[PDB]
Amino acid sequence: LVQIEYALAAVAGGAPSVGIKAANGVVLATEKKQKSILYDERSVHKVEPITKHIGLVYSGMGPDYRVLVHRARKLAQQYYLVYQEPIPTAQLVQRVASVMQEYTQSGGVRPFGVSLLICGWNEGRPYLFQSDPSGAYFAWKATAMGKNYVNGKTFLEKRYNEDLELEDAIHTAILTLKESFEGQMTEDNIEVGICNEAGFRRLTPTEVKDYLAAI
Amino acid sequence: TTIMAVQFDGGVVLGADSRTTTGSYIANRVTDKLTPIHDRIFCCRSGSAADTQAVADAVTYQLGFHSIELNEPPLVHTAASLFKEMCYRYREDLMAGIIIAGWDPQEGGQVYSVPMGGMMVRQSFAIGGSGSSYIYGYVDATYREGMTKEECLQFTANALALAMERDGSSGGVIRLAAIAESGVERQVLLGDQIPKFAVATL
Amino acid sequence: TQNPMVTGTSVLGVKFEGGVVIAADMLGSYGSLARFRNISRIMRVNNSTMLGASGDYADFQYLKQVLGQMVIDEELLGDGHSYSPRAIHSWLTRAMYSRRSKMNPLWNTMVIGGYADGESFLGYVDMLGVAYEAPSLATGYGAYLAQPLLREVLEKQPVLSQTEARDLVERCMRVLYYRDARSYNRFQIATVTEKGVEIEGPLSTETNWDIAHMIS
Amino acid sequence: FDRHITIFSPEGRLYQVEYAFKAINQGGLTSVAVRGKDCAVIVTQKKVPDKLLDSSTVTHLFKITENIGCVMTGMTADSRSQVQRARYEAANWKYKYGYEIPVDMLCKRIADISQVYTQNAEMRPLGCCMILIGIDEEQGPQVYKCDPAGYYCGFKATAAGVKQTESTSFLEKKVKKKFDWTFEQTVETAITCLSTVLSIDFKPSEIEVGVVTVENPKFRILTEAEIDAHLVALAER
Amino acid sequence: SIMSYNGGAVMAMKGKNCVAIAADRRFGIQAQMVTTDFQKIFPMGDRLYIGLAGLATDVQTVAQRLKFRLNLYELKEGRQIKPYTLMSMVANLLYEKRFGPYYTEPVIAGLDPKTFKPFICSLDLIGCPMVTDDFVVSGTCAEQMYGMCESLWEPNMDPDHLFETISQAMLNAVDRDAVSGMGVIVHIIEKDKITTRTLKARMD
Amino acid sequence: MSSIGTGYDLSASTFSPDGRVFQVEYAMKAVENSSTAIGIRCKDGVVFGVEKLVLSKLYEEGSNKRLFNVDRHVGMAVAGLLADARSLADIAREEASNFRSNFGYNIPLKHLADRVAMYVHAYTLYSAVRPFGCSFMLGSYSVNDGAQLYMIDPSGVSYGYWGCAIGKARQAAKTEIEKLQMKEMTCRDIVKEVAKIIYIVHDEVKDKAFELELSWVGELTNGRHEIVPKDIREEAEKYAKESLK
Amino acid sequence: RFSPYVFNGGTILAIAGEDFAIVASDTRLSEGFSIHTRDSPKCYKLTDKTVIGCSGFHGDCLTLTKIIEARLKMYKHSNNKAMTTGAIAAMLSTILYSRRFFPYYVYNIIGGLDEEGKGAVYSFDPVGSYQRDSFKAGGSASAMLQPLLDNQVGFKNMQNVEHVPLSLDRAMRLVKDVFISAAERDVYTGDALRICIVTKEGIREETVSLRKD
């Protein structure tokens, strides 16, 4: 379909999201600039938990994004009803990309204009995944999304190594946003979430501020 | 269970006991059977507790949504009609006797009975529950045309004390509520505040 | 309604020369308890139809709601067509039979009195759909205790005046007060004539208790 | 047909969603919400063009619950419809979940509904803007605004309508200069902002103010004597 | 009773680094014995068995639908199932028929496919899981099995004493029930081997 | 002026690039090609007046009633397209019926008008339906709330009105209702005024025969909406004929 | 528990002839030991050639005659002719059997004229089994009337009797005799006898007083 390529055009116009799979965890940093000072930046969140162990982030269209945040969380908890076990990250990406593929097959709708970076931690082992608006999903070591994702994907390919820790992966995920930020990021205009063995959590801005001070 | 509501000039006085029995075990002895349906419309719940709580929450929902659309305080006859439609539509699934009483600017203080079966009738005083049977003669003898707020609170307190005294399903504390234009005054009668009467000893 | 809760007892009715007069006491009993003592068991349907009902009073309030909304929805058209008493009677026969056939009856027994085109109408409908018309009707224990007096007067004199029918209805209500244990000493009398439906009440019976001293 | 329905352009745009914001400007009216320390006000203008019309029925301030109010800007029937849907979702939150709906949750819910209009091709986006105010139990005053795109955000202040961009420039110069707060100033800021960009020196029959305060969280619609009590206090300074 | 229509007697016992599951071998319609080689313990993995007592048609139906769901799980997920997760799967399968319930009460005995920790549990007919650390029993001779296991189970048994304990428990338990017995099969599940023995049981 | 052929005006489910839904506008332009219905609320009631055109001398002199009883206390004066107006008469009538059946009393005007303006609006955003081509006034009276007059256009917006006019000569009717102290007059003066305003805005050299239909609701009808007596109607006719001269 | 039926009494009777069909019934509607009315005829003109007699539960009788009248009109719309007696018979067999599992507690006797001008009587059970008879009594006193009709119309258990065809006047005498004799001993039968005679000239309809007890 042509609407899938045009939906990928709305993803590449979105804000940068960078996710890096470290040895002991996965980061998911995004670009969150407010258009003016009138907007409460505390209010809306881009990095978003799905379970206690899976979070995700996007580039593209936020209202399309919340539709799959809601349905990822439903698929996850209806897995948990059946198995009483937290859902594997790869299984959840199969479910969500099946949902995201459904809106490309049916006529009278458009595809999602959103591409997800699903992170996870299951069985002592981290996961980085990207679901495209087609319904296709790819496992990643590190990747970029949104505005100039190509330049981010080759900035990551230079600074990625496998024996990398989670804190150093936060440091090189801030740098991949900072290669395209346009104007001096702060703890109030980016948003990072990490998975580790303790589960997924979105970093508090006081905790983002010290990572930014380390750079 | 004994529920009671009396219309007076200016508003209504509602009353209920506080005993919920599971057979002949008092499961709850401080039960709040006086449910605020809207700001100046209460109901008195008797019958199956799950049924009455379900119907009271559903009429609370429908009535609050009705009031926000109409941008006005709701009528007491409107809440009574919503109880009537719910208690008549599911009259074979519900065992719920309701007394709706409240105040509204259009028609003053009102008391409506919705017993089991789902009918609706406006009354000056209504009694219900398994213990109201023991005070029908008392409320027929004692109700006077045109009592005041304090006289209706005292009348309701005395009749609920009598019904609590004779019914085993009734007991506990007396929960009173008097609804008028200025708002809702509620009070709990417990211990010596419940009107004692002498047993005919010797 | 599988189980009636607050029921109303007998509803009378008789045609006279110029209309129908029906009566019903103003009591709804829960079992034996005379719990609801000022409820009107007689509906005014429209200008030319009145309706008194026995049985479950919540079902009669349902039928009041449905049939009154039908009368409203008819009068909105302004096309000069009114529901006749026979049409209300036939609609109500269809309603009661349709509820019967779903094994969910409306526990009522109804007297539809009416007066259209200079012809009186008096119609019985019960919860099974058994409908007929007759010069005198009586539901409940009135079929046992009032319909004898009604049918003996309507045997001797087929055409009653309004005063004679009113006195006969009062007299049968006095009998039903004496012998029916669910009856009550407070009743409405509804009349439909050319002047429309008038509902008079609350009316009481004149009690006689001279036989109470004849016990020795 | 790529510009008639809500499907993507070759550069990834939704043109009907862009034209719904043009439709908001069709109403001719500008709304402003600002947020204080313990208060959040909404002010819109009340241009009544027909003088034999009942002006008590022309209002864009709507009660959603007792604690949540709402100013609407845009196509008026769309606005009343989105208000009825917000009133439904508020009552159903209270029924299902046992507590009053937060302002962010209601505004998120209405934006989630608006996304469906932006994605199914058989119906159009609903061309109007909702601004919700209300007092949060833990966060204080909340001002939330959802657009026909399905976005919502929380706002230190915001604006909706024809003069939205200049009202935003005014309030943006305002909220980085002072921390505007107090009951009186926040009505001052929302009256001055509307007045500055419309440039018409208000009389109280011409605007309408809706407030929530932390001291009394009931959504109030201001009386014309009370808009006088703010306009006289503002018009001598 | 619908449970006692065919008989049926399954237990599962926990050892040190090993579990034992054992079942009787009678298939009988009420009193009449039909076969003496009915399968009541099916494999649900390499080191993971489920035993089903109760109505024999529901033994077969539950075991086949569980094997269905389990093979789909182990292909869609790319791992052997953890025994707790198998318990949750069985509990879901039985609770879907909550008001139309499969008249069987499973026992699950197995080792963890990554840890080799012993797992035993058992369920009711509508899927209430019940994990123990000593023994679970299920069938028409439940009280006989509770007496024998509560007497004979001791912690930290090697698979030889585990075999002897579950064997004496099953044999003397089903020799006081009429519609049970006609053989006992015993599966010892170790880390490195599955031992399967059938016993010299009474045949009356 | 000039046509558009890009096709933003073919479904109600489509905005224009400047932000209009033209199908709603073209439906509202169907209303201004129809004859004028006026409605005036007064101190004790609401009075309706329609110039019902008689485009065959063969009709029954009372055919095509553009005044409707939608509830026993509410009336409906329609302009625009009759078949759509009768559909909305049935909708408003059913909505009043369902309100009484569910809540136990008469539907309030401002709630009937909102619940019918929502139906009219729900037919303004789908490609499977078209907007209604009728605007209509709802007018009620009761004791608690007073006179109530709302008008609903094809867009779905309902506003309250002291006077109102819908149709092709609605603007000069707004003029001649604006020359009138409706907040102090009684219903029996407003019928004379409604008749004379209908007879002023009626161009006989385009559409040459009509029947003036009046309906009131108020204190004088006990809050019931009725057609009103032929005596009062023909006195209003004579005052409108003489008034015009 | 709710009972969907009540036995309202009532005896019906039809007799076929060479050129006539006489359908008769009492007019007492009963319930238990009470009498609802004394004027409730159980015969119903369907077409200009067909009268149905309905007895049993009166609510089903009313509903069923209204359904048969509606189906007559539906037939005449879709087929541009009124129904025959046999077509109403077969149709009512289908109508009654469509309610097999919650039956019409109605004893139907259709009496009328066939398409060669002769009298036709069809006798139905409550679930629609019918056959064409020469005469049939149904309902409350059918076990009383039917042996006398077997005696006198059927010429059974008689030796050296002449088998003349039954004329209209003697069949009318037989109908009046059998309902007097049934009004004596059946308590549900009485108060009048409505007699419907179907001839080539049409349907004429007579009433005869019976006992009032």
Q: Which residues of C touch F93 (CB under 8 A)?
A: 73, 76
| In chain D, alpha helices (H) | 15-24, 76-97, 103-119, 164-175, 183-198, 224-234
Greatest CA separation found in chain C?
70
DSSP state of D63: E
Interface subset of C 114-133, CB within 8 angstroms of G: 124, 128-133
Sheet strand arrangement including D39-45:
D157-161, D30-35, D39-45, D207-213, D220-221
Closest C-alpha among C2, C75, C81, C14 to residue C50: C14
Rounded to whole angstroms, what are the CA distances from A38 to A159, D151, D172, D213? 36, 15, 6, 20
> In F13-30, which positions are buried (b, 16+ CB within 10 angstroms) versus exposed (e)?
bbbbeebbbbbbeebbeb
Size of interface B-C (CB pairs under 8 A): 36
d(CA E25, CA G38): 78
d(CA C143, CA C126): 13
Q: Is the dihedral of CA B32, B37, B39, B43 positive or negative?
A: negative
d(CA F113, CA F153): 11
**What are the strands, taking DSSP E only, across B73-159?**
96-104, 108-114, 121-123, 125-128
CB D23 within 8 Å of CB D147? no
CB D30 within 8 Å of CB D194? yes
Which chains border C (3 or more CB–CB pairs < 8 Å)? B, F, G
* Active-site pick, B1, B20, B60, B78: B1
Rg, Å, chain A Cα set? 16
| In chain G, alpha helices (H) | 58-79, 85-97, 142-152, 168-185
Q: Are strands D61-63 and D68-74 parallel, antiparallel or unpaired?
A: antiparallel
Closest residue in chain A to residue D141, using alpha carbons only:
A40
The pair of structure tokens assigned to A27 is 């980061």
DSSP state of D34: E
Tell me the three state secondary structure of residue E77.
coil
Tell me how crowded residue F77 is: count the other CB atoms within 10 A of its CB. Answer: 29
Query: Is C207 among the residues known to form the active site?
Result: no
> In E81-115, which positions are buried (b, 16+ CB within 10 angstroms) versus exposed (e)?
bbbbbbbbbbbebbbebeeebbbbbbbbbbbeeee
The pair of structure tokens assigned to F95 is 């909505």
Closest residue in chain C to residue G37, using alpha carbons only:
C134
d(CA D205, CA G73): 68
Backbone angles phi, psi at A10, to 5 degrees: -80, -20
d(CA B177, CA B186): 4
Backbone angles phi, psi at G83, to 5 degrees: -75, 155
CATH number at residue A192: 3.60.20.10
DSSP state of D218: S
**What are the strands, taking DSSP E only, across chain F?**
37-41, 45-53, 67-69, 74-78, 136-141, 147-152, 158-160, 163-166, 210-218, 225-226
**What are the strands, taking DSSP E only, across B48-193?**
96-104, 108-114, 121-123, 125-128, 174-180, 183-189
- Up-side HSE of residue A4: CA atoms within 13 Å toward CB? 15
Tell me the three state secondary structure of residue G109.
strand
Closest residue in chain E to residue A85, using alpha carbons only:
E85
d(CA F120, CA D68): 27
DSSP state of F220: G
CB C21 within 8 Å of CB C168? no
Q: Looking at the partner chain, which of F19, F120, F177 has a beta carbon nearest the beta carbon of D127?
A: F19
Tell me how crowded residue C20 is: count the other CB atoms within 10 A of its CB. Answer: 30
- Using the structure block, give the residue that is written with the tokens 């509804």: C190
Backbone angles phi, psi at B8, to 5 degrees: -125, -175
**What are the strands, taking DSSP E only, across chain C?**
6-8, 12-16, 19-25, 28-30, 33-36, 42-44, 49-56, 108-116, 119-126, 131-133, 136-138, 187-193, 196-203
Architecture of domain E1-204: 4-Layer Sandwich (3.60)
d(CA B130, CA C163): 46
Interface of D with F (CB under 8 A): 1, 4-5, 15-16, 19-26, 50-54, 56-58, 75-78, 80-81, 84, 122-127
Closest C-alpha among E187, E199, E186, E148 to residue E169: E148
The pair of structure tokens assigned to F228 is 């009103």
d(CA C90, CA E15): 81
Helix (H) or strand (E) holding F193: helix F187-200
At residue G53, what is the residue type? G
Residues 6+ apart with CB under 8 A from E155: E16, E134
d(CA C62, CA B118): 10
d(CA D153, CA G69): 68
Give the method of determination. cryo-EM
- Using the structure block, give the residue that is written with the tokens 């197995």: E110
Tell me how crowded residue B168 is: count the other CB atoms within 10 A of its CB. Answer: 12
CATH number at residue G81: 3.60.20.10
- Whether F19 sits inside 8 A of D23 (CB atoms) is yes
Interface of E with A (CB under 8 A): 76-77, 82, 84-85, 88-89, 92
d(CA F174, CA B159): 64
CB F207 within 8 Å of CB F32? no
Q: Are strands C28-30 and D220-221 parallel, antiparallel or unpaired?
A: unpaired
Sheet strand arrangement including G119-124:
G43-45, G50-56, G106-113, G119-124, G130-133
Residue E77 Cα, gap to closest chain A Cα (Å): 7
- Whether F127 sits inside 8 A of D123 (CB atoms) is yes
Size of interface B-D (CB pairs under 8 A): 21
- Using the structure block, give the residue that is written with the tokens 């006609």: E182
Closest C-alpha among A22, A57, A48 to residue A127: A22
Q: Do chains A and E touch (3 or more CB pairs under 8 A)?
A: yes
Residues 6+ apart with CB under 8 A from B193: B174
Closest residue in chain F to residue B69, using alpha carbons only:
F111
CA C39 remoteness from chain centre:
14
The pair of structure tokens assigned to E19 is 């579990």
Backbone angles phi, psi at B134, to 5 degrees: -85, -5
Tell me how crowded residue B137 is: count the other CB atoms within 10 A of its CB. Answer: 10
d(CA A183, CA A176): 14
At residue F35, what is the residue type? S
d(CA A184, CA G102): 82
CB F151 within 8 Å of CB F164? yes
Q: Are strands C6-8 and G130-133 parallel, antiparallel or unpaired?
A: unpaired
Residues 6+ apart with CB under 8 A from B34: B14, B15, B16, B42, B43, B44, B45, B175, B177, B186
d(CA A115, CA A96): 11
Q: What is the DSSP code string of F111-155?
A: THHHHHHHHHHHTTSBSSS---S--EEEEEE-SSS-EEEEEE-TT
From first CA to last CA, the distance across chain F in angstroms is 38
Kindly state whether G67 is in contact with chain C, defined as any CB-CB distance less than 8 angstroms. no
Tell me how crowded residue B201 is: count the other CB atoms within 10 A of its CB. Answer: 4
The pair of structure tokens assigned to A202 is 């979105």
Bridge partners of residue G13, in order along the sequence:
G24, G137
Tell me how crowded residue G115 is: count the other CB atoms within 10 A of its CB. Answer: 11
CATH number at residue C66: 3.60.20.10
Kindly state whether B18 is in contact with chain F, defined as any CB-CB distance less than 8 angstroms. no
Tell me the three state secondary structure of residue F175.
helix
d(CA F173, CA F39): 10
- Whether D144 sits inside 8 A of A113 (CB atoms) is no
Range of C49's domain?
1-216
Q: How many helices (H) and strands (E) does chain F have?
A: 6, 10
Residue B201 Cα, gap to closest chain C Cα (Å): 30
Residues 6+ apart with CB under 8 A from A100: A68, A111, A112, A116, A131, A132, A133, A134, A135
**What are the strands, taking DSSP E only, across E15-162?**
19-24, 27-29, 32-35, 41-43, 48-54, 104-111, 118-122, 130-132, 135-139
Residues 6+ apart with CB under 8 A from D216: none
CB B103 within 8 Å of CB B40? yes
The pair of structure tokens assigned to A74 is 């439903």
**What are the strands, taking DSSP E only, across B17-159?**
20-22, 25-28, 34-38, 41-47, 96-104, 108-114, 121-123, 125-128
**For B1-202, CATH number?**
3.60.20.10
Q: Which residues of D touch A38 (CB under 8 A)?
A: 155-158, 168, 171-172, 175
CB E168 within 8 Å of CB E1? no
Architecture of domain F1-245: 4-Layer Sandwich (3.60)
- Whether D80 sits inside 8 A of F117 (CB atoms) is yes
Closest C-alpha among C191, C50, C45, C25 to residue C113: C50
- Whether A13 sits inside 8 A of D176 (CB atoms) is no
Given resolution (angstroms): 2.7
d(CA E79, CA D131): 51
Overall domain count for chain G? 1
> Does residue F136 come out as left (phi exceeding 0), alpha (psi in the -120 to 50 range) or beta?
beta
CB D154 within 8 Å of CB D144? yes
- Up-side HSE of residue A136: CA atoms within 13 Å toward CB? 5
- Using the structure block, give the residue that is written with the tokens 């429908």: B62
Q: Are strands B125-128 and B121-123 parallel, antiparallel or unpaired?
A: unpaired
* Active-site pick, C1, C9, C109, C207: C1
* Domain D1-237 falls under CATH 3.60.20.10: yes
Q: What is the DSSP code string of G1-32?
A: ---S------EEEEEE-SS-EEEEEE--EEET
Size of interface A-E (CB pairs under 8 A): 18
d(CA A50, CA A66): 11
Q: Which residues of B touch D94 (CB under 8 A)?
A: 61, 64
DSSP state of A58: E
d(CA F3, CA E85): 68
Rounded to whole angstroms, what are the CA distances from D15 to D211, F14, F129? 35, 10, 22
Which chains border F (3 or more CB–CB pairs < 8 Å)? B, C, D
d(CA D179, CA D177): 7
Q: How many residues does chain D have?
A: 237
